[PDB]
Design a binder for this molecule. Sequence first.
Ligand code: 6Z0
Ligand code: NA
Ligand code: NA
Length: 385
Amino acid sequence: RGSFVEMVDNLRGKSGQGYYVEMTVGSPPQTLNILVDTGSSNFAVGAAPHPFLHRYYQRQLSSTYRDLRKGVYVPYTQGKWEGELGTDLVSIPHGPNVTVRANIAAITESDKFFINGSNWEGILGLAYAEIARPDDSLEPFFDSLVKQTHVPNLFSLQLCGAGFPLASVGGSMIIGGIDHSLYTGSLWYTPIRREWYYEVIIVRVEINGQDLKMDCKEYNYDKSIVDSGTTNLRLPKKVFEAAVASIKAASSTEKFPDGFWLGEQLVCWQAGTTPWNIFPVISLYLMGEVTNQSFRITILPQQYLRPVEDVATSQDDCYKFAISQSSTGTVMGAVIMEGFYVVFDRARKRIGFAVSACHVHDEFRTAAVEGPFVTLDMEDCGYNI
Ligand SMILES: C[C@]1(c2cc(NC(=O)c3ccc(C#N)cn3)ccc2F)NC(=N)OCC1(F)F
Ligand code: NA
Ligand code: NA
């Protein structure tokens, strides 16, 4: 409890390519790097020689592979994978000293799934069975881990982002606990509304302290989730309109092309001259643990202006605006998570936020987690189908 030195710094990544953990599958163990995704619930790995892959799971080499004789086809908004289901022995070398029998989708065909130039070969879906494919009888990895071992039913993520001048990203996934060195201040908890995605309720939104003043249902239309497998802070379309209008207004000392705000083009500045000061902070108030109580998390432009390194077109420091409109609800992606240590307290159906000890900031502003606030009618903020 509180100290897990063996798991600290067990995540790696490259800007724009996500955060992965080393895992082993099979007997003898095959090592793979696996994207950590709190926005899905399948453990799925490359199992054939796709050209983007550094390596892939070779089931024929594992003495402990058990075939489920069942396939799954998994389409996403863009791209898809198809695989064959089975079980095998799985470990996380920089994790708990346990080995468990987990479901594994051996990916045999894919499209726009793997990233050319990335160093990961599969995905670890850490969300709940309700969103597992093909259905909720396919037990997620974390559920198997907790069922088969004494590992406590929680994990925490510290995602440490990037800045110019371009280093790899990193962080820590603490499995079965919390490491107090990874944050400062106190943890503040918000309820997991429903166990499917890591669904939460946003009750107020401010841009540099100025409330957008929308019906709070709009903030959670049709849901709000905490998602390590998405880069952007995605906002429902109506909310995005309001937020960007407000952010533009706050930054109006400099003018940027409309396309920049829509993620249609980059903006670049002479190296070391990024004008962070002109950009506002973004605050989300989350439903608290107690009736009529909330707390707020605040991120900086260092989180939502993402460095883009691979730009042959330009010699300068180029950035993408990583707040974007959504039709799937609010997605608190890496843009949010990189500000915080985030505790997925599954045992107590709650998500904790604390200021990350590694987050990117400057001399004038830091990311923040502050409470309590008085917020009435927070249960009305939830959207119902
Ligand atoms: C399953 C999936 C998914 C995510 C990824 N995710 C990434 O590539 C990725 C890239 C950068 C960062 C950062 N920072 C996080 N994730 C890749 C393939 C998927 F298939 N997970 C998800 N949370 O939303 C999109 C998705 F549903 F499509
Ligand atoms: Na257990
Ligand atoms: Na601390």
